[PDB]
């Protein structure tokens, strides 16, 4: 059946691109256009399968995410860093504040930038930001591990997450670029952007799910569930592959890939 085959295709697109710095939103508007699923019911479908990819990080960093809110499961949490420091809830809070303040204050304006021409620009500009972060980052990272991050690095990454409010800019692209520019290693900057995505997008979709709750019906549960679960599986493969891939590879290929995706946005929509 078409409805669930499409739900499985959008699921694998969301699972791969949500946490890769390649703009899940950008890929979603392309494939959604080629599939024909572009109505108000699509925007509500694409926000619930985001919660599927959310749950992937949640599963992958289960013990870590709970330790930040005070729940330690009777075993020492595993240390990722060269110092005696530990990533705290304050690190997450600082990484959220700037984009939250700007997101709330400019909600109506942010929503008016969801054009395909804006997503195209955010794919190119966000790609250029990845290149600048790769070319400007220090030789020796100040925070090689996640637990080596400072309150200042966390806050500066948080300010960089405002760029993610630009539709098509890829929250992971913005936050990982800012991490590398603040002396955070690619691995820890990717880890921190995933962890930051959990409170950001769970509050983001909960926000979207409330304002768009009216569209949900009894018939959406089969489609909305097949995509949710698909985005969960694919993201768990994507995040685990990415974190091992980025240990050896740079972000240059992802930037160039974003330029190719920008070309597709123009071919498909203009
Ligand atoms: C759903 C739409 C499709 C999703 C688009 C995904 C984005 C990936 C694009 C560019 C990254 C290219 C880098 C990944 C390729 C690396 C493969 C590889 O083998 O490189 C490893 C290297 O050998 C180390 O030792
Ligand atoms: C708002 C979104 C902002 C996007 C920024 C756009 C373009 C930045 C690209 C400029 C990259 C050029 C920097 C290269 C460089 O100067 O490298 C210096 C040297 O490598 C170090 O010692
Ligand atoms: Hg350079
Ligand atoms: Hg900011």
UniProtKB/Swiss-Prot annotation:
Task of the protein: Catalyzes the dephosphorylation of undecaprenyl diphosphate (UPP). Confers resistance to bacitracin.
Entries under PANTHER family matching the protein: UNDECAPRENYL-DIPHOSPHATASE
Pfam families for this protein: BacA (PF02673)
EC number: 3.6.1.27
Transmembrane segments: 3-23, 42-62, 87-107, 113-133, 187-207, 219-239, 249-269
Origin: domain of life: Bacteria
Topological relation to the membrane, as annotated: Multi-pass membrane protein
Primary localisation category: membrane
Name of the protein described by the UniProt record: Undecaprenyl-diphosphatase
GO MF annotation terms: pyrophosphatase activity; undecaprenyl-diphosphatase activity
Reaction catalysed by this enzyme: di-trans,octa-cis-undecaprenyl diphosphate + H2O = di-trans,octa-cis-undecaprenyl phosphate + phosphate + H(+)
Keywords noted in UniProt: Antibiotic resistance, Cell inner membrane, Cell membrane, Cell shape, Cell wall biogenesis/degradation, Hydrolase, Membrane, Peptidoglycan synthesis, Transmembrane, Transmembrane helix
Family, similarity comment: Belongs to the UppP family.
Gene designation per UniProt: uppP
UniProt-listed GO biological process terms: cell wall organization; peptidoglycan biosynthetic process; peptidoglycan metabolic process; regulation of cell shape; response to antibiotic
Organism of origin: Escherichia coli (strain K12)
